[PDB]
Design a protein around this ligand. Sequence first.
Ligand SMILES: Cc1cc2nc3c(=O)[nH]c(=O)nc-3n(C[C@H](O)[C@H](O)[C@H](O)COP(=O)(O)OP(=O)(O)OC[C@H]3O[C@@H](n4cnc5c(N)ncnc54)[C@H](O)[C@@H]3O)c2cc1C
Ligand SMILES: Cc1cc2nc3c(=O)[nH]c(=O)nc-3n(C[C@H](O)[C@H](O)[C@H](O)COP(=O)(O)OP(=O)(O)OC[C@H]3O[C@@H](n4cnc5c(N)ncnc54)[C@H](O)[C@@H]3O)c2cc1C
Ligand SMILES: COC(=O)c1cccc(NS(C)(=O)=O)c1
Ligand SMILES: COC(=O)c1cccc(NS(C)(=O)=O)c1
Ligand SMILES: [Br-]
Ligand SMILES: [Mg+2]
Ligand SMILES: [Mg+2]
Lengths: 483, 486
Amino acid sequence: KAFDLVVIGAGSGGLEAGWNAATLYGKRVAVVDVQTSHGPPFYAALGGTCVNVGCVPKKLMVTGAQYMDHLRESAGFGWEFDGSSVKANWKKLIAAKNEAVLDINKSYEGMFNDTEGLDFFLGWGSLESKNVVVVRETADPKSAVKERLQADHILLATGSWPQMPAIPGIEHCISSNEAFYLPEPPRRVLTVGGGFISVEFAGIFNAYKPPGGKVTLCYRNNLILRGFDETIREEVTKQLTANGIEIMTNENPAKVSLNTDGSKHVTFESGKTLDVDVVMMAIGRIPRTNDLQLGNVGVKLTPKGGVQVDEFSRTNVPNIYAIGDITDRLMLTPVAINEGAALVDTVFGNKPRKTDHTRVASAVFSIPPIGTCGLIEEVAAKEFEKVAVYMSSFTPLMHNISGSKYKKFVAKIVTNHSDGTVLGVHLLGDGAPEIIQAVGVCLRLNAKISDFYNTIGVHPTSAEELCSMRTPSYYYVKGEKME
Amino acid sequence: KAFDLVVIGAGSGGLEAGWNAATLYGKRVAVVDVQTSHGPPFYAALGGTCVNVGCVPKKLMVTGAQYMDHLRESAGFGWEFDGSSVKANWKKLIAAKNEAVLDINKSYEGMFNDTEGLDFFLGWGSLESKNVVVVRETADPKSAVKERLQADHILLATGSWPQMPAIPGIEHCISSNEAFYLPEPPRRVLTVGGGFISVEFAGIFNAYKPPGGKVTLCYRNNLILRGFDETIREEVTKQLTANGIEIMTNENPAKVSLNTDGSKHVTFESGKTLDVDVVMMAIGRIPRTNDLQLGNVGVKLTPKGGVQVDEFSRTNVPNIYAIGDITDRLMLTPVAINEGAALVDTVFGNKPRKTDHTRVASAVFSIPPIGTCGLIEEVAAKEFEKVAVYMSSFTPLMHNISGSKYKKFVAKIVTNHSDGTVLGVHLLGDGAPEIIQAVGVCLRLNAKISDFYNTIGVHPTSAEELCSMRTPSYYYVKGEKMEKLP
Ligand SMILES: Cc1cc2nc3c(=O)[nH]c(=O)nc-3n(C[C@H](O)[C@H](O)[C@H](O)COP(=O)(O)OP(=O)(O)OC[C@H]3O[C@@H](n4cnc5c(N)ncnc54)[C@H](O)[C@@H]3O)c2cc1C
Ligand SMILES: Cc1cc2nc3c(=O)[nH]c(=O)nc-3n(C[C@H](O)[C@H](O)[C@H](O)COP(=O)(O)OP(=O)(O)OC[C@H]3O[C@@H](n4cnc5c(N)ncnc54)[C@H](O)[C@@H]3O)c2cc1C
Ligand SMILES: COC(=O)c1cccc(NS(C)(=O)=O)c1
Ligand SMILES: COC(=O)c1cccc(NS(C)(=O)=O)c1
Ligand SMILES: [Br-]
Ligand SMILES: [Mg+2]
Ligand SMILES: [Mg+2]
């Protein structure tokens, strides 16, 4: 069958591109994915990684984990109940999450059923030729051919996949994919990695662990969450520790073996040992290009395996484009969506647009969470002669009373001190992901620190700290920190 | 006894002005207040109304109230416990709030001693003359002079005070002042008024009521929260009703009598009656001008009764200024603070600056809460030829799992459709007050709808809805509502 556009991967970016091309530009569109609903064996499905095994289910599970803190914190406000009756029923959480995800799966199914000129094909998409997508039974390119789709234009939108270190016993470990389907909450779990997925899952597992359970997070480098503001990295380390999570910095698994009872015996490079029920590897995500048979058309890959693209998401092959995680830039759902919309506007609208990958608001749903937008000060200090840091850090009042006195809210604004232009805003504490969104809009409008401190506060909020900082805490002059 | 600046009222506006003058411009500042710490008899104290009997304790108490919802909602996420064992200990909450507020009172005491020039005087400020404030022992002008203060400049910052309707049995009723110190949580309460204080307290009382409890909110007109977005007014009304609060609209107490058991018999204008344990009046706050003796120096008051001021907070009398609730405009702490900061940066900094009373972000800590900045559409529609309204309203997913399906999140953007300029943003739902703060910065920057929709979303959040709206839901054209433009 013949299509204006064939999209390989029915995910965040692929569905934005396919829907826009079909509905805004009246193109005949085919979209291919390996599964119509969430979970094993292929985990991602119609809706993409975010819907099925990412942002959506993880936010529901972090919300669930937050009740451990609410139940404890309620006491400071006079709430009373039988503490010994308290159980975290992980089975109920997983069943609730599975229904929410399946409902989305079903709605996307309905969207393809109800949207003329937008067609879904089930199976494994690869490039036969520069104008032909082949859909096969399995990832094996010798598997049976279900469809051959003639394509004026081809969008690669297959996303990324968890990286598993080729160590002894890798097969006894899981990724985030399986973590979403654990039938029982692990008593002892090792999260491997200092990234958002490791930290977020450490929080989830910490809340739902059975009695006498323990969550351990291991990271090779000295301080979790590289790429984030350094004050926040230190404070979120302290606040995880305070909620009973063991942070093992400068540690990596060398091998995993099964104890006789089937639990996991972990040997860390430092020689050290840990016995756990689950080893969750969250050390990286790699672009999913292996199965695309891109050798058939000579699409240029990086050594890593990302599809190389210009700022308009164009491969070295005309009529073949790539957006989202397969491009191995910013692995965020709204970025994938923005790239897909920008690509379709450019190609089918002749409305030339490229995604701005700077000043993108993002979050970590740690407990407590992070909200951030733009540059951290160390990065700003290499690109700007004079950098000012405005910092406010304090245990909010609700948290003196709650008993979580360790829950310091951190609000930091990084400026170009030459003109006051805000380069970066970094938040740690309850509400941070919600606060940071409209900060994204501020940075698009080249907000200066004077635009924040001249705005009238909303009181009482954590956010008003952003509008209360008149005077730098410290500076960088020619890369050098000065108090 | 000689000062650059004498401030009457050590509140939100008074302290900002006092401390800035001192620490920024090395000026010599006297600040008068009637009380050094919270509670009866004068309720407000060092720190002002917000600290003592306002934003600060209210927010701690609404946070406490929120646990009623969290405890229930936890079950959807698999939390299990003995629901029959749950008790809300009001006495614990009030003791915790009292300790929190006292620590802040003590925080400000340090500030006054730990700061040269800046000195606190205790007692009642009044105007003797253009350049003399007299501190007396009571609010009676005839009471003993504790101090006579010489003033190159006088700031009036005495704030506001609850208005109590002059009905038979008003003495059986309380204001928000007494509500902060009730020894027991009322089983049955009538909150009187449709403003943020009545709505916030209805939520608090609703969470802490003993078994067989009932919270009734009455309002004299048809729909609570006048001045807020209409969609949000109707939605809050529904969401409060869904959480067990009875909203009596078009009803107003005509009198209250004590029943023989100490309970309150409320007779409405309509002839309806209701028995409650507490009648909390929250029908308005009025500026505290009486006690300053303004007739002595001829400071002019408004047809409404607030100190008349120009954009620079200047009275008709040179050297004499007024900020915050005494000016009877926007009664918000951050507005008071902004006015104080501007007045001092003006007069002492030689850097004249005027508070912008437009595009002010504010909140209602209703459950769920309101976050708002700028114009409601009905107001926009009278100023601008063509107004667009962008609206997204849905029960967020977590609240489908939580069982609170009635918690619809409302995001509304109101624009000048001629150029896309955002005139107002109106949010209802968890996190609305936090989301709206940086929206206030956006509006100061004259953000257009396209600045919001071209910004990349943070996912998953409620806030990202603000960056997802490209197409108007409807318009006002020369005042007229319609789905489509001509
Ligand atoms: C645990 C986790 C949490 C995350 N949390 C967040 C978060 O909170 N916020 C956020 O913004 N981002 C988050 N992300 C990242 C976000 O999920 C991704 O950036 C986003 O889904 C990428 O979108 P995409 O279009 O590139 O690909 P995807 O959404 O991954 O879609 C790719 C699709 O292609 C399909 N596919 C792959 N190969 C083939 C093939 N050969 N033929 C057919 N179909 C194929 C897959 O089945 C999949 O459905 C998270 C990711 C993970 C793993
Ligand atoms: C229940 C309630 C909840 C509120 N919630 C919020 C909220 O969440 N957010 C918000 O922004 N605003 C809120 N407000 C409003 C806020 O409290 C006021 O806007 C703010 O306190 C006004 O500050 P001000 O400087 O005008 O005076 P105040 O802060 O009221 O200070 C006035 C001070 O003057 C003193 N005083 C009065 N007369 C004299 C005299 N003659 N001599 C000496 N001292 C005198 C008083 O003791 C008092 O301390 C709330 C108000 C109340 C009542
Ligand atoms: C051999 O390592 C793997 O590829 C491996 C091992 C164990 C588990 C997984 N989970 S997955 C395919 O979902 O990423 C991969
Ligand atoms: C006019 O004042 C009253 O009649 C009255 C009645 C009942 C209570 C109060 N408490 S107050 C002064 O704090 O607002 C005043
Ligand atoms: Br490091
Ligand atoms: Mg179709
Ligand atoms: Mg002093």
